[PDB]
Amino acid sequence: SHMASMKKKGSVVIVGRINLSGDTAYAQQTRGEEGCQETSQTGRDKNQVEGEVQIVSTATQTFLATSINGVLWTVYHGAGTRTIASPKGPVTQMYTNVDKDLVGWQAPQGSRSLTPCTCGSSDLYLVTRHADVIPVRRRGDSRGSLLSPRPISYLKGSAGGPLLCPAGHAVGIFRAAVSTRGVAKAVAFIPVESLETTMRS
Ligand SMILES: CC[C@@H]1C[C@]1(NC(=O)[C@@H]1C[C@@H]2CN1C(=O)[C@H](C(C)(C)C)NC(=O)OCC(C)(C)CCCCc1cccc3c1CN(C3)C(=O)O2)C(=O)NS(=O)(=O)C1CC1
Numbered sequence: 001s002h003m004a005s006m007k008k009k010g011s012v013v014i015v016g017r018i019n020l021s022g023d024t025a026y027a028q029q030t031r032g033e034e035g036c037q038e039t040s041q042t043g044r045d046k047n048q049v050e051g052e053v054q055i056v057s058t059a060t061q062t063f064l065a066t067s068i069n070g071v072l073w074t075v076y077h078g079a080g081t082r083t084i085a086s087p088k089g090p091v092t093q094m095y096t097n098v099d100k101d102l103v104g105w106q107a108p109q110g111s112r113s114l115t116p117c118t119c120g121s122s123d124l125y126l127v128t129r130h131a132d133v134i135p136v137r138r139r140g141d142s143r144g145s146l147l148s149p150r151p152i153s154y155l156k157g158s159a160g161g162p163l164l165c166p167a168g169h170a171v172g173i174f175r176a177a178v179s180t181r182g183v184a185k186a187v188a189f190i191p192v193e194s195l196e197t198t199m200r201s
């Protein structure tokens, strides 16, 4: 009820990227913790952005965001309704869908977008925040099985990251792990066709 002292949530901040440009996938950090905290408050991020898969953080969480068709997408369960920091200040979401666990902002200048997959292939690859490339067999519209199961710890913080086909097109956005006794045997994703439908609504 004390309106003048009510706080605002900070912006999502890009703090690094998963580099997939070469022969080796690796994580790069582009901003440290103090800079991230400051940038979340101001919403003003003048760092150069590159690549398709960004590592993003709020004050309380860190996860991934993936550019597809000129939109930087991530999970609602990480970003909520937050703005993203940008060179000219905070940028409001252009897509928000809590039912899909999906949000999106206009892709930052300097980023590159993945192309939506039209291959109809079921041999997929999940990219994690540690730049592991994990083979996943597609098992339905929104699920795929890990060829080698992992503790959920290994996948934590990778929501918002891509599932890719063999040619490196975007097939989906990772949202949840299918876990039993802490072991992830499968992953649940937002299919790229669902993003494409969201882009038409
Ligand atoms: C640990 C690596 C996981 C990727 C990850 N995500 C999660 O942790 C999501 C967040 C939350 C729970 N969850 C799970 O993965 C849980 C789990 C393992 C924690 C036990 N699994 C599950 O419920 O399976 C049940 C299943 C039926 C398969 C759900 C299907 C999806 C159904 C669904 C549909 C529509 C909307 C929503 C859902 C689920 N949803 C909203 C939602 O908010 O889920 C993460 O790394 N997050 S993160 O650390 O980056 C975080 C900072 C952002």
Ligand SMILES: [Zn+2]
Pocket: 116, 117, 118, 119, 120, 121, 165, 166, 167, 168, 169
């Ligand atoms: Zn493809």
